[PDB]
Design an enzyme around this catalytic site. Structure first.
Site, mmCIF file in Angstrom:
data_model
loop_
_atom_site.group_PDB
_atom_site.id
_atom_site.type_symbol
_atom_site.label_atom_id
_atom_site.label_comp_id
_atom_site.label_asym_id
_atom_site.label_seq_id
_atom_site.Cartn_x
_atom_site.Cartn_y
_atom_site.Cartn_z
ATOM 1 N N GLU A 64 -0.175 14.045 -4.373
ATOM 2 C CA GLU A 64 -0.465 12.741 -4.953
ATOM 3 C C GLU A 64 -1.961 12.483 -4.825
ATOM 4 O O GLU A 64 -2.720 13.340 -4.362
ATOM 5 C CB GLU A 64 0.358 11.640 -4.278
ATOM 6 C CG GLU A 64 0.065 11.482 -2.796
ATOM 7 C CD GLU A 64 1.045 10.555 -2.104
ATOM 8 O OE1 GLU A 64 2.267 10.747 -2.270
ATOM 9 O OE2 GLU A 64 0.588 9.634 -1.396
ATOM 10 N N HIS A 83 1.630 4.309 0.210
ATOM 11 C CA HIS A 83 1.210 5.244 1.226
ATOM 12 C C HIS A 83 -0.240 4.937 1.583
ATOM 13 O O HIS A 83 -1.094 4.596 0.762
ATOM 14 C CB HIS A 83 1.273 6.734 0.830
ATOM 15 C CG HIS A 83 2.615 7.303 0.582
ATOM 16 N ND1 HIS A 83 2.816 8.511 -0.125
ATOM 17 C CD2 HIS A 83 3.863 6.796 0.975
ATOM 18 C CE1 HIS A 83 4.133 8.716 -0.154
ATOM 19 N NE2 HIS A 83 4.848 7.697 0.506
#
Lengths: 393, 305
Positions: B217, B259
Site C-alpha cells: 500500500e 493505517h
C-alpha cells in the site's frame, strides 16, 4: 491531529523558539484592531485553514501583505467566512473563519529545517538545506546535494554538536550558528514532547537584525498518542462516532472494514469506471451503531449516488445494514458484498426481507454493479426522470 | 551480529508453543479461546498482578520470563493495550522469546521507534507487527486474529501490510485450489519488526513455497526495497513467480488512510512508484484486488506448475 498555524506558533513561543509577533482575528473588525496595534503600516495577513490556492470570493493566495489597518480589514473580509480551494482540497474546500495578523519581517537569508521520523533511519532525523522559502520536494529532485540529513539517537537525544554541524553545513554565518543550533535543539524537545510526526519550518531565517527566527511552522501529530497528548488534542461526526473517515470528490459510497481493503475497494471502483466518494474503515469490533453512523455519514453527502459496502467477516452484519437502511430512509442503490460465517442466510436476509439491497459474492462483480447503478442514477438525473429498481432473487 | 539472524523464527510449525501477553483481558481471552480450538499450542499467558491463577485451564504468570521458563514457549502474542504494548514487546525481547507477534494497533510511533532501537541490536527475538493480524501456518500453527477457516495448506507464501485485504487474497488462492504455505501479516505501522524482504528471504528458501503474493500500500519504501531484493535474488532461471497488489492509487496525499503507515507525504510513498518498481523487478502487479488468486494461478500455468 493538526492545528492552525497560529496554534503551532504558540507552541514554539512557549518553548523559547522565537516567532514573528502575531495575533488572531476571527472577524474583519478585529483585524483592524490587531493591525493598528502593530504600527498601522507593514502587516501580514495569513489565512488559517486546516496556502497558495484560490478563495471562493475570487482572491487568490492565502497570505497577503497590506500597509494599513483599513486594508487589513478589507483583505480579511474576503477571507474570514469564505472557503479556500487548493489542489489538496479537491473540488470542495476548507472554511476560513479566522486569519493570523502578524508583523512583517524582512529576511536576509532563508533556510529549510525539519524534524521527522523517517523509516529509512528508523528514528528521528534533522533535515536542513540552504534552499529555504521554496518547495522542498522540487529541490529534493533538482539538487538533492542541497539536502542534508542528520539522524538522532532516540536514547541519547540530540547532541549540541549535531545541531551545530548541521547549521554550518546549511550555510548559517558563524556568528549565529549557535543560536540556530539552540533553536533546532528546542524544536527537537518540542518534537518529542508533543509526539509530533514532523515539525517543518519553511523557512527558518536570519533576521534583518541577524537573529535566527522561524517564519512558518507546520506540525503533524501522531494521533496514536492522543491519550498522552491532552493539551494538543483539545484544540464531521466521523471522529465523534470514532470511524476512520475521509471525504473525497467521488459519488460512490464506500463502507469497508480494514484500511487495506477500504483502499482496495476505492481502487477497484476507479478501475471499473466509478469514483469513490469516501474512505471509511469500520474495522473490528463494529457494532450496529457504527454502520448506522457510517451510513448516515455517507448519505449526508447529496452527491453520493450509490453505496458499496465490502465486509470480510454474516447474518448479524446483514441485520445491521438492513436496520440502518430503513431508519435513514435510504433511497439510493446499495450493493453489499459479505464474506464470512453465514453467507447463504445473510443473502436470503437482505433479499427476503423488504428493501432493495443487492448482494454480491465476487469483488469485481460488486464493483461493476455499484458503478453501473450509479451511472443509471446519473443518466436518470440528466434525463430528468426517476428510476425505480427491481432486483433478482 | 545482525538482527536479520532471527528471520528463521517467522516460520511457525506444529511444534510452536505460544503464550499470550495480556491473557486476562477481553481481547487476549477471546483469541486464546480460538487458538486452542484451531489446534495451536497456546500453553500460557502473562498478566501483571494475576500470576499463579488459572485462566481457561491454563497457568497465568506475572512476567514473560516466568512464563517462558515454566512452559518452554518459543513464541508470544501480544494483546496489551497501546499505552503498554510497546513495553510488552520490550519485555519479550529481554526474555529472548524467539518470535513475538504484536497484534495491538494504536501504539505511539515514538514508542515503536524506541522499541525498534532495542530490537535492531539483538538476535534472539524476531518481532512481527505491531498493528498486524499475525502469522499462520495453515493446519499447523496460528498466531494472531486471522480466521483459520479460510486458510488451506498450499504452495503460495503471502506477506501483506493489511489485514482483511490479506484474508481476501487467502480466500482467492483457496477458491482456485492452490492454498497457502505461510501467511505473514507485517502490519500497517510505519515502524515494525518485519518487512517484505524478511519474508521474501523465507519464501525464496522454502521448498513448500513455489509462489509468492506481496500485498502492499502507500507509505514508505518497503515495496521498492523488496523490488530491488527480488531483482537480485529472484531473477533468471528457477525463479519463483511473485504476484502483487498495491492499494492507494486513489488515496489523497497528505492523509492517513486508517493505517498509521498509509500516508503520502512530501511526494513520497505513492502507489504508482511502488507498482512501477515491482513491475520492473519482474513482479506481475494485478490492478484489481479481486484477481490476485487468478493471476498467481495463470502465472503457474505459464510454467506448467
Amino acid at each position: 491531529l493538526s492545528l492552525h498555524e497560529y496554534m503551532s506558533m504558540e507552541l514554539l513561543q512557549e518553548a523559547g523558539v522565537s516567532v514573528p509577533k502575531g495575533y488572531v482575528a476571527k472577524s474583519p473588525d478585529e483585524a483592524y484592531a490587531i493591525a493598528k496595534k502593530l504600527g498601522s503600516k507593514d502587516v501580514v495577513i495569513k489565512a488559517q485553514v486546516l496556502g497558495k490556492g484560490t478563495f471562493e470570493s475570487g482572491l487568490k493566495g492565502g497570505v497577503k501583505i497590506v500597509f494599513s489597518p483599513e486594508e487589513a480589514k478589507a483583505v480579511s473580509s474576503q477571507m474570514i467566512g469564505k472557503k479556500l480551494f487548493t489542489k489538496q482540497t479537491g473540488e470542495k474546500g476548507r472554511i476560513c473563519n479566522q486569519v493570523l495578523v502578524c508583523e512583517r519581517k524582512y529576511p536576509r537569508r532563508e533556510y529549510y529545517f525539519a524534524i521527522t521520523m523517517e523509516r529509512s533511519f528508523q528514528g528521528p532525523v534533522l533535515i536542513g538545506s540552504s534552499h529555504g522559502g521554496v518547495n522542498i520536494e522540487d529541490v529534493a529532485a533538482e539538487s538533492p546535494e542541497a539536502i542534508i540529513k542528520e539522524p538522532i539517537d532516540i536514547e541519547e537525544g540530540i547532541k549540541k554538536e549535531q545541531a551545530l554541524q548541521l547549521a554550518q553545513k546549511m550555510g548559517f554565518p558563524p556568528n549565529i550558528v549557535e543560536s540556530a543550533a539552540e533553536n533546532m535543539v528546542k524544536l527537537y524537545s518540542l518534537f518529542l514532547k508533543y509526539d509530533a510526526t514532523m515539525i517543518e519550518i519553511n523557512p527558518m531565517v536570519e533576521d534583518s537584525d541577524g537573529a535566527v527566527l522561524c517564519m512558518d511552522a507546520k506540525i503533524n501529530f501522531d494521533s496514536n498518542s492522543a491519550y498522552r497528548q491532552k493539551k494538543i488534542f483539545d484544540l464531521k461526526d466521523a471522529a465523534k462516532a470514532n470511524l476512520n473517515y475521509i471525504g473525497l470528490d467521488g459519488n460512490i459510497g464506500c463502507l469497508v472494514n480494514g484500511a487495506g481493503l477500504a483502499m482496495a475497494t476505492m481502487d477497484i471502483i476507479k478501475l471499473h469506471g466509478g469514483t469513490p466518494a469516501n474512505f471509511l474503515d469500520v474495522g473490528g469490533g463494529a457494532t450496529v451503531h457504527q454502520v448506522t453512523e457510517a451510513f448516515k455519514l455517507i448519505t449526508s453527502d447529496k452527491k453520493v449516488l450509490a453505496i458499496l459496502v465490502n465486509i470480510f467477516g454474516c447474518d448479524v452484519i446483514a441485520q445491521g445494514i438492513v436496520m440502518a437502511v430503513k431508519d435513514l430512509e435510504i433511497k439510493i442503490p446499495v450493493v453489499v458484498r459479505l464474506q464470512g460465517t453465514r453467507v447463504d442466510d445473510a443473502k436470503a436476509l437482505i433479499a427476503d426481507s423488504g428493501l432493495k439491497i443487492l448482494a454480491c459474492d465476487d469483488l469485481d462483480e460488486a464493483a461493476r454493479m455499484v458503478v453501473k447503478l450509479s451511472e443509471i442514477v446519473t443518466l436518470a438525473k440528466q434525463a430528468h426522470v426517476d428510476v425505480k429498481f427491481q432486483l433478482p432473487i | 551480529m545482525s538482527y536479520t539472524a532471527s528471520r528463521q523464527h517467522l516460520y511457525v510449525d506444529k511444534n510452536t508453543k505460544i503464550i499470550c501477553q495480556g491473557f486476562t483481558g477481553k481481547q487476549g481471552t477471546f483469541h486464546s479461546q480460538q487458538a486452542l480450538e484451531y489446534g495451536t499450542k497456546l500453553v500460557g499467558g502473562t498478566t501483571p498482578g494475576k500470576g499463579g491463577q488459572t485462566h481457561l485451564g491454563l497457568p497465568v504468570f506475572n512476567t514473560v520470563k516466568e512464563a517462558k521458563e515454566q512452559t518452554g514457549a518459543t513464541a508470544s502474542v501480544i494483546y496489551v493495550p497501546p499505552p503498554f504494548a510497546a513495553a510488552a514487546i520490550n519485555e519479550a525481547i529481554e526474555a529472548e522469546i524467539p518470535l513475538v507477534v504484536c497484534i495491538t494497533e494504536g501504539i505511539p510511533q515514538q514508542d515503536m521507534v524506541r522499541v525498534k532501537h532495542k530490537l535492531l541490536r539483538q538476535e534472539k527475538t524476531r518481532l512481527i507487527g505491531p498493528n498486524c493480524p499475525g502469522v499462520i501456518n495453515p493446519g499447523e500453527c496460528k498466531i494472531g486474529i486471522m480466521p483459520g477457516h479460510i486458510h488451506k495448506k498450499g504452495r503460495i507464501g503471502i506477506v501483506s501490510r493489511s489485514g482483511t485485504l490479506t484474508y481476501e487474497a487467502v480466500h482467492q488462492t483457496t477458491q482456485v485450489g492452490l492454498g497457502q504455505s505461510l501467511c505473514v501479516g507485517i502490519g500497517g505501522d510505519p515502524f515494525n519488526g518485519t518487512d517484505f524482504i524478511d519474508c521474501l528471504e523465507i519464501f525464496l528458501n522454502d521448498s513448500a513455497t513455489e509462489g509468492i503474493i506481496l500485498i502492499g500500500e502507500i507509505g514508505g519504501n518497503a515495496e521498492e526495497n523488496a523490488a530491488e531484493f527480488l531483482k537480485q535474488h529472484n531473477s533468471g532461471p528457477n525463479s519463483k513467480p511473485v504476484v502483487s497488489f498495491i492499494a492507494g492509487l486513489t488515496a489523497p496525499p497528505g492523509r492517513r488512510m486508517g493505517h498509521a503507515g498509509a500516508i503520502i507525504a512530501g511526494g513520497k510513498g505513492g502507489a504508482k512508484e511502488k507498482i512501477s518498481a515491482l513491475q520492473s523487478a519482474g513482479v506481475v502487479v494485478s490492478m484489481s484486488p479481486a484477481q490476485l488468486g487468478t493471476t498467481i494461478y495463470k502465472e503457474f500455468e505459464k510454467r506448467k506448475m
